[PDB]
């Protein structure tokens with residue numbers, strides 16, 4: 001764990017250690033209005049011994065939402081709710097980035113004001129469910145809907161919505177933003193060949209499949225500065241329905257394109273739930289040459305694997321998702337080899353403080 005507990009520079013920030021709390025949707029936002037709240041602020045501040053916190057995905061508009069009760073970042077009240085979170089986190093000494101979210105086709109009309117979802121094309125995500133509010137206190141799981149293909153004008157609108165969400169995040173006191181371009185969501189529906197059937201300049205070729213990503217990142221950078229923009233990618237997982245035919249090429253190229261934008265970090269989502277594909281070391285080393293900023297990986301890491309990835313020159317920082325849910329003091333536990341609590345799946349989403357803020361710190 002020695003390297004894991006070394007500080008690191010992230011743009012204009014000095015971070016305490018190499019541990020990241022990656023984005024973790026908890027569906028705790030206040031209703032009506034999908035507003036970040038007190039319980040969330042406590043939750044994040046409890047975990048502020050991380051080097052970096054990346055918020056749960058936060059939708060950039062009403063039609064960007066995938067799941068019931070996720071917090072938005074487009075209304076004034078939503079910005080203010082996030083400010084209570086960022087104030088709490090900053091009082092503990094920690095950096096926090098907002099994960100800007102558009103789910104594209106991975107939603108249900110019930111979550112987007114009855115609208116049909118949008119995507120690169122009209123392809124439904126196969127074997128994918130989201131959850132909706134059905135009036136009960138627990139999430140109601142449902143099949144996703146068939147999307148409509150985005151027009152030119154839809155692309156302009158979404159870019160504008162991302163751009164403004166970045167400014168909103170700065171107004172909310174975040175230190176930066178993370179673009180969610182991973183886990184089968186909207187941008188990923190353009191990147192991955194088998195999700196993109198477009199015949200215009202946003203599909204077919206590799207350069208066209210990366211164009212939406214390029215244009216969104218350019219707008220984010222223009223709005224808030226490259227030193228405040230990270231991006232998340234998922235080259236090899238396919239759980240939410242996006243498959244690329246030549247992911248080593250596509251994602252090495254994406255990494256090099258993002259390097260050209262000088263984004264402050266690149267975050268690789270190596271596992272999604274129990275989708276844990278073989279991610280060759282040779283590929284990881286290629287990504288490390290293609291993108292020369294701070295490289296973050298998350299997915300089934302433990303202390304040993306995290307330290308090894310850093311010492312082998314594969315990663316600069318490591319995210320721990322599920323362990324951070326149940327271990328607010330995860331860094332201290334990793335450093336000392338204290339046993340980790342395990343999380344309760346039934347309280348991951350929805351509800352209140354139970355299973356959110358009531359996991360204790362370690363006590364022998």
Ligand SMILES: Cc1cc2nc3c(=O)[nH]c(=O)nc-3n(C[C@H](O)[C@H](O)[C@H](O)COP(=O)(O)O)c2cc1C
Nearest residue numbers: 022023024025056057271298299300320321322348
């Ligand atoms: C409850 C839960 C919610 C998640 N929500 C998001 C999210 O909002 N955005 C995202 O990019 N990843 C999300 N993820 C994925 C995690 O960031 C992480 O990449 C994944 O859980 C693998 O890391 P782990 O094996 O350490 O948990 C979620 C994971 C879990 C368990």
Ligand SMILES: CCCCCCCCO[C@@H]1O[C@H](CO)[C@@H](O)[C@H](O)[C@H]1O
Nearest residue numbers: 037038039040041042043091353357
């Ligand atoms: C610095 C010491 C003062 C601590 C301020 C504590 C703020 C807690 O705030 C409380 O959080 C609860 C959720 O846990 C909500 O249900 C309450 O409405 C909210 O007032």
Ligand SMILES: CCCCCCCCO[C@@H]1O[C@H](CO)[C@@H](O)[C@H](O)[C@H]1O
Nearest residue numbers: 038041042045046084088328360361
């Ligand atoms: C409205 C938001 C109020 C946030 C108050 C800070 C919440 C985190 O409080 C932290 O909780 C840890 C237990 O997990 C304690 O061990 C730390 O001492 C405590 O400061």
